Coordinates of C-alpha atoms in Angstrom, one line a residue:
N1 CA -61.6 33.8 -63.8
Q2 CA -58.1 34.4 -62.3
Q3 CA -57.0 36.1 -65.5
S4 CA -60.2 38.3 -65.5
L5 CA -59.7 39.3 -61.9
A6 CA -56.0 40.0 -62.2
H7 CA -56.7 42.7 -64.8
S8 CA -59.6 44.4 -62.9
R9 CA -59.8 47.2 -60.3
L10 CA -59.7 44.7 -57.5
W11 CA -56.1 45.6 -56.4
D12 CA -57.1 49.2 -55.7
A13 CA -59.9 48.0 -53.4
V14 CA -57.6 45.8 -51.4
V15 CA -55.3 48.8 -50.9
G16 CA -58.1 50.9 -49.4
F17 CA -59.0 48.1 -47.0
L18 CA -55.4 47.9 -45.8
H19 CA -55.5 51.6 -45.0
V20 CA -58.6 51.2 -42.7
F21 CA -57.5 48.1 -40.9
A22 CA -54.1 49.4 -39.8
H23 CA -55.7 52.6 -38.5
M24 CA -58.8 50.9 -36.9
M25 CA -57.3 48.4 -34.5
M26 CA -54.8 50.9 -33.0
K27 CA -57.8 53.1 -32.3
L28 CA -60.1 50.2 -31.0
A29 CA -57.4 48.5 -28.9
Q30 CA -57.2 51.5 -26.6
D31 CA -60.7 51.0 -25.2
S32 CA -62.1 47.8 -23.8
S33 CA -65.8 48.8 -24.4
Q34 CA -65.3 48.2 -28.1
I35 CA -63.7 44.8 -27.8
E36 CA -66.6 43.0 -29.4
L37 CA -66.2 45.2 -32.5
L38 CA -62.5 44.6 -32.8
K39 CA -62.9 40.8 -33.0
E40 CA -65.3 41.2 -35.9
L41 CA -62.8 43.4 -37.7
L42 CA -60.1 40.8 -37.4
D43 CA -62.5 38.1 -38.7
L44 CA -62.9 40.3 -41.8
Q45 CA -59.1 40.5 -42.4
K46 CA -58.7 36.7 -42.6
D47 CA -61.6 36.5 -45.1
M48 CA -59.6 38.8 -47.4
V49 CA -56.3 37.1 -47.0
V50 CA -57.7 33.7 -47.9
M51 CA -59.0 35.1 -51.2
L52 CA -55.5 36.3 -51.9
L53 CA -54.2 32.8 -51.4
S54 CA -56.9 31.6 -53.8
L55 CA -55.2 33.7 -56.5
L56 CA -51.9 31.9 -56.0
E57 CA -53.2 28.4 -56.9
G58 CA -51.2 26.8 -59.7
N59 CA -48.7 29.6 -59.7
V60 CA -45.3 28.9 -61.3
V61 CA -42.1 30.5 -60.1
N62 CA -41.8 34.2 -61.2
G63 CA -45.5 34.2 -62.2
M64 CA -47.1 37.6 -63.1
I65 CA -49.8 37.4 -60.5
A66 CA -47.2 37.0 -57.7
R67 CA -45.3 40.0 -59.0
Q68 CA -48.5 42.1 -59.1
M69 CA -49.2 41.1 -55.5
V70 CA -45.6 42.1 -54.5
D71 CA -46.2 45.5 -56.2
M72 CA -49.5 45.9 -54.4
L73 CA -47.8 45.2 -51.1
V74 CA -45.0 47.6 -51.8
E75 CA -47.7 50.3 -52.5
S76 CA -49.1 49.8 -48.9
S77 CA -45.9 49.0 -47.1
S78 CA -46.7 51.6 -44.4
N79 CA -50.0 50.0 -43.3
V80 CA -48.5 46.5 -43.7
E81 CA -45.6 47.5 -41.4
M82 CA -48.1 48.9 -38.9
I83 CA -50.1 45.7 -38.8
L84 CA -46.9 43.6 -38.4
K85 CA -45.8 45.8 -35.5
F86 CA -49.3 45.4 -33.9
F87 CA -49.0 41.7 -34.0
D88 CA -45.3 41.6 -32.8
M89 CA -45.9 43.9 -29.9
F90 CA -48.4 41.6 -28.2
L91 CA -46.6 38.4 -29.2
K92 CA -43.6 39.7 -27.4
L93 CA -45.6 41.1 -24.4
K94 CA -47.2 37.7 -23.8
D95 CA -43.8 36.1 -23.3
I96 CA -42.2 39.0 -21.4
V97 CA -45.0 39.1 -18.8
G98 CA -44.4 35.5 -17.9
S99 CA -40.6 35.9 -17.5
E100 CA -39.2 35.3 -14.0
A101 CA -37.4 38.7 -14.1
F102 CA -40.7 40.6 -14.5
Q103 CA -42.2 38.6 -11.6
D104 CA -39.6 40.3 -9.3
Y105 CA -41.2 43.7 -9.7
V106 CA -44.8 42.6 -8.8
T107 CA -45.1 42.7 -5.0
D108 CA -48.8 43.3 -4.1
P109 CA -50.4 40.1 -2.7
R110 CA -53.3 40.6 -5.1
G111 CA -50.9 40.3 -8.0
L112 CA -51.5 43.8 -9.5
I113 CA -48.7 46.1 -10.5
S114 CA -48.4 49.9 -10.5
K115 CA -48.0 51.9 -13.7
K116 CA -44.7 53.3 -12.5
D117 CA -43.5 49.8 -11.6
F118 CA -44.7 48.6 -15.0
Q119 CA -42.8 51.3 -16.8
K120 CA -39.7 50.7 -14.7
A121 CA -39.7 47.0 -15.5
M122 CA -40.3 47.6 -19.2
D123 CA -37.4 50.0 -19.4
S124 CA -35.2 47.6 -17.4
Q125 CA -35.9 44.8 -19.9
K126 CA -34.9 47.2 -22.7
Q127 CA -36.8 45.6 -25.6
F128 CA -39.4 48.4 -26.5
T129 CA -39.0 52.0 -27.3
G130 CA -40.6 54.8 -25.3
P131 CA -43.6 55.3 -27.5
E132 CA -44.3 51.6 -27.5
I133 CA -44.3 51.5 -23.7
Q134 CA -46.6 54.5 -23.7
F135 CA -49.0 52.7 -26.1
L136 CA -49.0 49.6 -23.8
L137 CA -49.9 51.9 -20.9
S138 CA -52.7 53.5 -22.9
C139 CA -54.1 50.1 -23.8
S140 CA -53.8 49.0 -20.2
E141 CA -57.1 49.1 -18.3
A142 CA -55.7 50.7 -15.2
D143 CA -58.3 51.4 -12.5
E144 CA -58.7 54.6 -10.3
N145 CA -55.8 53.2 -8.1
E146 CA -53.4 52.9 -11.1
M147 CA -53.5 49.2 -10.6
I148 CA -52.7 46.9 -13.6
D149 CA -53.9 43.3 -13.9
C150 CA -51.1 41.8 -16.0
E151 CA -52.7 38.3 -16.1
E152 CA -55.8 39.6 -17.9
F153 CA -53.8 42.1 -20.0
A154 CA -51.5 39.5 -21.5
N155 CA -54.3 37.1 -22.6
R156 CA -56.7 39.6 -24.1
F157 CA -55.5 39.4 -27.7
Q158 CA -54.5 35.8 -28.1
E159 CA -57.0 33.9 -30.2
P160 CA -58.1 36.3 -33.0
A161 CA -54.5 37.6 -33.5
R162 CA -53.4 34.0 -33.7
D163 CA -56.0 33.2 -36.3
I164 CA -55.1 36.1 -38.6
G165 CA -51.4 35.9 -38.0
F166 CA -51.1 32.3 -39.1
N167 CA -52.6 33.2 -42.5
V168 CA -50.4 36.3 -42.8
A169 CA -47.3 34.1 -42.2
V170 CA -48.5 31.5 -44.7
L171 CA -49.0 34.3 -47.3
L172 CA -45.5 35.8 -46.6
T173 CA -43.8 32.3 -46.8
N174 CA -45.5 31.5 -50.1
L175 CA -44.6 34.8 -51.7
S176 CA -41.0 34.5 -50.5
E177 CA -40.6 31.0 -51.9
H178 CA -42.2 31.8 -55.2
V179 CA -40.6 35.1 -55.9
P180 CA -36.9 34.9 -55.0
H181 CA -34.3 37.7 -55.5
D182 CA -36.6 40.6 -54.5
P183 CA -35.2 42.9 -51.8
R184 CA -38.5 44.5 -50.9
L185 CA -40.1 41.1 -50.0
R186 CA -36.9 40.4 -48.1
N187 CA -37.4 43.6 -46.0
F188 CA -41.0 42.6 -45.4
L189 CA -39.8 39.2 -44.2
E190 CA -37.2 40.8 -42.0
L191 CA -39.9 42.9 -40.3
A192 CA -41.9 39.8 -39.5
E193 CA -39.2 37.6 -37.9
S194 CA -41.1 37.1 -34.6

């Protein structure tokens, strides 16, 4: 069955899915009203990745199936990079918000922070680019008073992103250990250090 599937059209299908996912979450993350949809999308992604792992059972070093998988990933490098950035941004934001330095800028007794203060703190930390900070501001659910609840903002995307990211990391580690001496997989690993 593995040999039959490896020579079919399946690879093409996977590529198409990787195009949609990378574009969908970025669109869905900007509005809270669609949150219940976004979770479902993430639950789909895991179900794909597991199947990919099922294709690597009993795989020897430098097997042909792993090389085909690496070629398929190289073909959709752009969407893969977008997904990795999507995970890394929130993983870093969760730790940055809880930093003591960031707690200096919040001064309202209710604990909310202004958008200008948020941008000032983000620029002061100097870890994100301008467009990234603008994307965080767009995803922020600021009210009519430009007031941002950082405590709710940080914890919005924890559990589902965790569940998908663990499998993504497992897949990357397996591919790295079973196909050494490939620079493209090395670049993909470098993009996913966090």
